[PDB]
Amino acid sequence: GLGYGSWEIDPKDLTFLKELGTGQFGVVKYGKWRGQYDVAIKMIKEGSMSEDEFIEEAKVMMNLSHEKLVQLYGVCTKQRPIFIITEYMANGCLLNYLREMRHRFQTQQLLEMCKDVCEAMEYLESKQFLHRDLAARNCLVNDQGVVKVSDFGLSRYVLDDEYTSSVGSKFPVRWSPPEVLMYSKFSSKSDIWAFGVLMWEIYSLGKMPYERFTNSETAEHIAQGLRLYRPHLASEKVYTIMYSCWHEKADERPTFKILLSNILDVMDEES
Numbered sequence: 001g002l003g004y005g006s007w008e009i010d011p012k013d014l015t016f017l018k019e020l021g022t023g024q025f026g027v028v029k030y031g032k033w034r035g036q037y038d039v040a041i042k043m044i045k046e047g048s049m050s051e052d053e054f055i056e057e058a059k060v061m062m063n064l065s066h067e068k069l070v071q072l073y074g075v076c077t078k079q080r081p082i083f084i085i086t087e088y089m090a091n092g093c094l095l096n097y098l099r100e101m102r103h104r105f106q107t108q109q110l111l112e113m114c115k116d117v118c119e120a121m122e123y124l125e126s127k128q129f130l131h132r133d134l135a136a137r138n139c140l141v142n143d144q145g146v147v148k149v150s151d152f153g154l155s156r157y158v159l160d161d162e163y164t165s166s167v168g169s170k171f172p173v174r175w176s177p178p179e180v181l182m183y184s185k186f187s188s189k190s191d192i193w194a195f196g197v198l199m200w201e202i203y204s205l206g207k208m209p210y211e212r213f214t215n216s217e218t219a220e221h222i223a224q225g226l227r228l229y230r231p232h233l234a235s236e237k238v239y240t241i242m243y244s245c246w247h248e249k250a251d252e253r254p255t256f257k258i259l260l261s262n263i264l265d266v267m268d269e270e271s
């Protein structure tokens with residue numbers, strides 16, 4: 001109402017029920033909108049974000065819409081701390097879920113998690129939008145077991161320099177291609193490299209990539225041309241798909257449309 005814009009949510013409409021965890025920006029909570037609809041509420045700690053820039057980008061993000069993309073309900077900004085509001089994802093982050101051994105997953109289930117993420121990424125590529133930090137720690141799982149992509153684009157507005165640069169002690173070295181580590185060259189083909197590393201995390205049931213090395217030692221291995229190798233649960237056809245994402249030359253890596261084609265073909269052959 002008077003005079004909220006179409007991207008702005010009134011905090012008086014929220015009821016708070018349970019605490020979910022603590023991330024880099026602060027606390028995340030579960031509650032209800034207007035007494036009836038489930039939501040997650042991310043509360044941004046003071047001093048941590050370029051807030052005017054994020055607000056302008058939130059207007060664009062509201063117009064993105066896909067079933068395998070976590071859906072943004074709005075933001076609360078006439079206050080401090082600002083809140084970010086989305087749908088509630090009952091089974092948490094993908095990394096923690098993979099590590100629970102009680103699930104005893106079949107390989108048919110692991111291939112469907114890869115297809116879910118590939119569908120979301122094909123949509124973003126169609127709109128010229130980069131994720132910039134894709135990894136299992138950033139995907140979420142709902143009550144029906146469906147995987148969705150979140151925190152897309154968010155790294156652009158973080159002020160702490162430890163996470164922002166190649167030298168930084170919190171930068172995602174283990175998810176980055178050679179041309180990012182040497183020259184800071186970002187493109188659709190650095191998102192492709194990160195997706196291949198995500199397939200590896202799924203088939204290894206949540207292991208840390210390059211688990212025996214430091215970040216410094218990993219950057220040197222990559223520049224000498226060496227690579228991750230085949231997880232025990234991956235067929236020769238599945239390994240061929242994830243390896244294709246790591247070509248030394250960027251322009252020889254596939255698109256998200258082609259990868260999705262490759263994944264449907266294996267599903268039909270292996271089941």
Ligand SMILES: *CCC(=O)N1CCC[C@H](c2cnc(Oc3ccc(Oc4ccccc4)cc3)c(C(N)=O)c2)C1
Nearest residue numbers: 020021028040042084086087088089092093151152154
């Ligand atoms: C691996 C452990 C972990 O990370 N989690 C378990 C505790 C609950 C955590 C969680 C975090 N957020 C969240 O919902 C949101 C996600 C993103 C968000 O902001 C953006 C920014 C840019 C683009 C899209 C979204 C706001 C809320 C949930 C949840 N929905 O249930 C859970 C995950």
